[PDB]
Symmetry: none
């Protein structure tokens, strides 16, 4: 007998993030996984990935240049952070 | 007997994010997975992915230039953060 | 006997996001998955993907230029964050 | 016997988002999946995808230029965030 | 015996979004899927997709230019966020 109890009795206004998982039992291959339940990606860059089988096989001339240079601003308050009876403010 | 209880009794106005999962039992291949239940992607860039089988096989001349340079502004409050009896404000 | 209970008894005005999943048992191939139950994509860019079998096979001359440079502004409050008895405001 | 109960008894005006799933048992191929139950896509750009079998096979001259540079403004309050007994305002 | 109960007893004016799914058992091919139950697409752009079998096979000269640069403004309140006993306002 497998028995799981999470947050059986709750009272008084909480702020919660819950994730419960119960289990009982070519270039890239993956099998029966769980990925990115709570994931935050910001300013993620990928350039070349899995081009293919035998690319640029013979006599290839490649010039690769990656320029990542710009005025960018990211302002975040309370990222993945639950709060209660509090105050959050962003002033510019 | 498999028995799961989540948040059996609740009272008093909570703010919740719930995710419950129960289980019982070529270039890219994937099998019977679970992905991105709570996912936030911001400013995500991908340039070249899985072009194909045998690209640019012979005598290929490629000039690759990636410029990512611009005035961009992102302002976020309470990202994936539930709140209760609180105050959230963004002032510019 | 498989038995799942989520939020059996609730009272007092909560704000909830619920996701319950129960289970019992060429370039890209995928099988019997679950994807993007709660997904937020903002400013997502993809340029070249899965062009095909044998592209640019012989004597290909390619000039690739990617310019991503512009005045853009994103303002968001309470992204994927349920709230109760609170205050949310965006002032510009 | 498979038995699932979600939100058995509810009282007092909640604000909820519910998603319940129960299960019992060439370039791109997909099989018996579930995708994008709650998905929000904003400013999503795709340029080249699945052009076909053997494109630009011989003696192809391609000039590719992507300019994404313009004054754009996105203002959102309470994205995928249910609220109750609260206040939401966007003032410009 | 498969038995599913969602929101058995409800009282007191809630605001809900419900999605219940129960199951028991060439370039692109798809099979017996479920897609986009609650999907919001804003400012989505696609340029070239599935052109066909063997396009631009021989001696093709292509100039591709994509300009996305204009004054555009999007203002949204309560996107996919049910509310109750609250106040929502957009003032410009």
């Amino acid at each position: 007998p497998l028995m799981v109890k999470v947050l059986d009795a709750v009272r008084g206004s909480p702020a919660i993030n819950v994730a419960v998982h119960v289990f009982r039992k070519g270039l890239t291959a993956e099998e029966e996984f769980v990925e990115g339940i709570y994931k935050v990606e910001i300013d993620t860059k990928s350039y070349w990935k899995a081009l293919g089988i035998s690319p640029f096989h013979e006599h290839a001339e490649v010039v690769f240049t990656a320029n990542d240079s710009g005025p960018r601003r990211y302002t975040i308050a309370a990222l993945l952070s639950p709060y209660s009876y509090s105050t959050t403010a962003v002033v510019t």
